[PDB]
């Protein structure tokens, strides 16, 4: 669940 998570902290600005 820490990975799910890290693997989108760079895809949470390109679509918010």
């Given at each position: 669940w820490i990975q799910x998570i890290?693997?989108?902290?760079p895809q949470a600005p390109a679509p918010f």
């Open positions: 890290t693997a989108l902290a």
